[PDB]
Symmetry: none
Subunit: 200 residues, 2 copies
Amino acid sequence: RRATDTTPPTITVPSDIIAYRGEEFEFYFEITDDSGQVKNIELSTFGKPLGLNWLEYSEDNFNVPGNATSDNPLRVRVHGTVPLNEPIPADKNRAQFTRTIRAWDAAGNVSSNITFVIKYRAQTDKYNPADPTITYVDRLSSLSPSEKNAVEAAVRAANPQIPAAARITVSANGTVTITYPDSSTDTITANRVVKDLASS
Amino acid sequence: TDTTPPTITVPSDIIAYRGEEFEFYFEITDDSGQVKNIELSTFGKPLGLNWLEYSEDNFNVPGNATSDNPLRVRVHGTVPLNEPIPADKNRAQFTRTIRAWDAAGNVSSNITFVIKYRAQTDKYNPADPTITYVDRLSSLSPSEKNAVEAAVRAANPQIPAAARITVSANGTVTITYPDSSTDTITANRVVKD
Ligand SMILES: CC(=O)N[C@H]1[C@H]([C@H](O)[C@H](O)CO)O[C@@](O[C@@H]2[C@@H](O)[C@H](O)O[C@H](CO)[C@@H]2O)(C(=O)O)C[C@@H]1O
Ligand SMILES: [Ca+2]
Ligand SMILES: [Ca+2]
Ligand SMILES: [Ca+2]
Ligand SMILES: [Ca+2]
Ligand SMILES: [Ca+2]
Ligand SMILES: [Ca+2]
Ligand SMILES: [Ca+2]
C-alpha cells in the first residue's frame, strides 16, 4: 500500500463550449483524485492571468474529504456572460478564448494545465426568426404608422423565442430589421411581411 | 298667427382633428314651441361634406323647441385622415350655414357655423415618460430604445394605439400619429446617463 499520495487530480473538460454575447451561459468541469479529495482549482491563460473578469465559478464543496471520487466527481459550475460588445473579428474562427485549468489535491499535487475553449458568437447566430403572419397594407411602398405597429406585433408574435430586449424596426416598404441586444441583426424581406390589401 | 322664424344657436368653437370623430349640437327655438326641420348647406348650395351626419330625432313635434327645452340637434362626423391643411390656418376650416323652419313654414335666415380642422398633433401633447438610464447618451442600445418606447407608451394611454413611437440614437423620441403629423420629445426629457 502506497505510503503517500503522489498523483495529481484528473480533470474532464467540456468539449463544445459555445456562448452568445449578452446571454448567460454555464459549463461544468468534472474532477477526481485518487484520494477522493480536491482542494481547489486555477483557471489561467497557460499560467498567466485569466483576463476574463466576466467568468466565474463556485468554490462550494472545495477541499472537503470525499468531494472528488470516481463515483462522485467534483462538479465545478463555471458561468458568466460574454460582454454585449465583445469584438468578433472578420474570421469567426477567431471568436474564442483558449484557456487552461488545473487542480490541487490535499497532498500538494497539482495537475498539469489542460486546455478548454470558450467560443463566443453574435446573438443572431442563435436566433432564426419565423416569418410573421402577413400584414395587409394600403400602399406597399409607404406603410402607415398603424401598419408598422401591426407588422412589428406580427413579427414579435411569430417569434416568442427571440429576446424581449431585441428591437424590431419596420421600414417604409415593410422591410423588417430585428436588432438583437448585441446589435447583431436578422432581416425579413418585405415580400414575406406585407401584401397589398386591395389585390388580396 | 305665427309669423316669426325659429332662432338658432351654434357652437362657437367647433374644432375637429383629422381621422377622429367629433360631435357638436345645434340648439333651436321657436316662439310656437315647435320646430319642423332644419337644413345644412353651403350658403344655400349643397353641403358637400358627406362625412358629416346629424340626427333628426324629435323633429316636427309639438313642444320640441321651447325657450326652456330647445331642440338639440346632434351633429357628428370624421374629417378625412388625409384632408389637406393649408399653410394659413385661417383657411383650415369649412364655413357652412344652417336654417330651420316651424310648422307654419316660417324659415330662418342662413346662420353661419364653422368647422375648424387640424392635424392630430394639434390635439395630442405627450406626457413625460419615466426616465430611462442609458450607458451612452449618444448611442442607445436596442434594449434601451425598447425601454424608452415602453415608457413613452405607458405614460400616454390617451395617444392613439395606432400612433408609432420611434427612438433615435440619442434617445430623441418621434411620435407619428395616424394622419402622419408628429410630436417630438427631446432626449433630455427621456434619457439620462
Ligand atoms: C478575439 C481573439 O482575438 N481571440 C483569440 C485569442 C486571444 O488572442 C486571447 O486568448 C485573449 O487574450 O487567442 C487565441 O489564441 C491563443 C494564442 O494567442 C496563444 O499564443 O496560443 C494559444 C494556443 O492554444 C491560442 O491559440 C485563443 O485563445 O484560441 C486565438 C483567438 O482568435
Ligand atoms: Ca492525489
Ligand atoms: Ca439569425
Ligand atoms: Ca314661429
Ligand atoms: Ca325636448
Ligand atoms: Ca402635439
Ligand atoms: Ca393644441
Ligand atoms: Ca415598437
